[PDB]
Design a binder for these strands. Structure first.
Lengths: 118, 112, 112, 118
DNA sequence: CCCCCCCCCCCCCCCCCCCCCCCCCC
DNA sequence: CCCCCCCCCCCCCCCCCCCCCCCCCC
């Protein structure tokens, strides 16, 4: 219970956001946030980056057009949304992946600057 | 590149916590939290099922305190994992940091 | 402009939960979660103290199940509030959605 | 326990980010996120926006310069960080406010587009 | 610390993003 | 379902951001 399960992710888009449409004209954007744990000593005596988390994201409407206009592969982003499960297909009788249904996203300003325009 | 992705989940254990032991003898408890959105409105909207892992002393306490159907509050960090299983799939799991039975519909006698 | 700001807090009740009743007779429980960062490293880094509010049946269960020093997992949404108090200050508080005693150092007998 | 208490906030800066410095040259930016619950029926029979949450934020280093270069009063932002208490002063024997120590922030792309440049 | 669910209202108690300054501002 | 804390490993169970499509990609 307690409504949906929300989540915030920070990471980089593994690719350019795929923008697609509905016969009525509603935009939906799809992309994946690769989240790599930095300074997460895991293997040998030394230290570096840890294994990565890849979450596929969905976003709709105006924001979808903005996501596609504003972001590309490699962009560092801050994302909030809610985790949704989906039963997917072809090679997998009744597949199932988790996905984030985005509420808000933006390019992080840790290593980059940004011009904000409507 | 960015810390550990945290998550809080509230829901019900789909079963009793499976308790096991790692090679060095670390107590590990596994279980799955079924999270159902209460939600013209629907009722039984699409539930979310997350597999959880928890270690050491807490694993023992979870195994001693919780059962199938227990409503729980869980915080931890999402981790992705791959696994062969007869020559390989990839599932997201929660590495639990804290978990407790929820007090919304129940009372609890804590043994500190 | 943006939904309700949620928060999860883990820590210890600074005292026993104060139970009270609203004019219509709604059960409301208040208490404060002291959250201490474990942390060349320090030890008793600056603790965070958050006042919590919880309502109805859960308030009763909290008051029946929890005491000063109980370690708890809490989720809710941050709310700001102003108050006269002898002609006015403004404090942030958590409106609890779920709370439970943590199973990290303790076991719990849930009464579903 | 469990390390720090993290938080994600979405909202608008009540003002332009105040940028300041340290004798050594480290940038720190301060600003406040006004978070207004939208579609949160509270008073009369009708519905609209609910009462607002104002959290003062702190951010350091490079990001602080980027925040100050990129954002202004009214900007909608996504913020993640950790809640910190502080004992503040003048008119208040030993004051105390909560504050967010920002880890990442960015302009939300719900109602705006953005050019990302390093 | 259990009196029927509309809104009492104070931030004080134990080895699962860490080096650095202002009054809560629709 | 309690065998000493390094890493077993499957997403299946009840009135506190809601109108809309792909294989987990450092």
């Amino acid at each position: 219970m307690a409504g949906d399960t929300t989540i915030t992710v920070v990471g980089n888009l593994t690719a350019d956001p795929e923008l697609r449409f509905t016969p009525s004209g509603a935009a939906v954007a799809n992309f994946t946030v690769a989240s790599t744990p930095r300074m997460f000593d895991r293997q040998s005596g030394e230290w570096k980056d840890g294994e990565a988390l890849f979450l596929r994201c969905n976003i709709w409407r105006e924001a979808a057009e903005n996501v596609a206009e504003s972001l590309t592969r490699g962009s560092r982003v801050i994302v909030t949304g809610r985790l949704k499960q989906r039963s997917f297909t072809r090679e997998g009788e009744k597949r199932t992946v988790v996905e984030v249904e985005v509420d808000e996203i933006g390019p992080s300003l840790r290593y980059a600057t940004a011009k904000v325009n409507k």
